[PDB]
Amino acid sequence: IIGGREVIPHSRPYMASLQRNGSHLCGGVLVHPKWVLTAAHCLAQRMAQLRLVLGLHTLDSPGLTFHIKAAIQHPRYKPVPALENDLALLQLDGKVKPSRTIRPLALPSKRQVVAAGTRCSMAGWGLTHQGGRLSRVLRELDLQVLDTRMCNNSRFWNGSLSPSMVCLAADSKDQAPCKGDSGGPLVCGKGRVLAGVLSFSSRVCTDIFKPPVATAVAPYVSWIRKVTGRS
């Protein structure tokens, strides 16, 4: 996150860090004691070397580490250039016991809409500057949902955002999620309800003509319930 703020430690106990050989790769959201929801493009990796770490604030710190038994990418995931259905569910090799630092975030209703104007925020350990390095501490950034039609403007995303995608903007031009931030949850409203999983931007994180986009959670809730086996 570029231009964001350090969170209060463990104030977002659903946060997962997906890591390869101890190195952070993407965020995730714990959506069940045995399942982390994250971005599918994050799993273009040798799974043998991937771990999920829970309850972290500071990135170099133990937290609680899980091996991954299975990585189930959405059936209709299409990678770049079309980054469609950019979601994967990861099965932990143990079962999370809810505590103060680690806890699942509930899925929204399957009929949640994320309307233009909705005030949200997201969290991650991603880059703090263009071409920089990961954040040492978990950070957060307020984001507002933009009208998808305006985001699809020729100078912006040029018709390529589907109805399942949530177009986002910070309050300032110099604030944006950046590399390492995908997979992490977008929570919206006063009740801080899970509404999206961050996906993509353009190569430059703060490019105002390429606002960040998250995959909306609500249209995938029934898939998620089928996969997790919890109707």
Binding site: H41, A82, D86, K179, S199, F200, K210
Partner: peptide, 6 residues
């Protein structure tokens, strides 16, 4: 053009 995964 260019979607770049975050």
């Amino acid at each position: 053009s260019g979607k770049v995964p975050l």
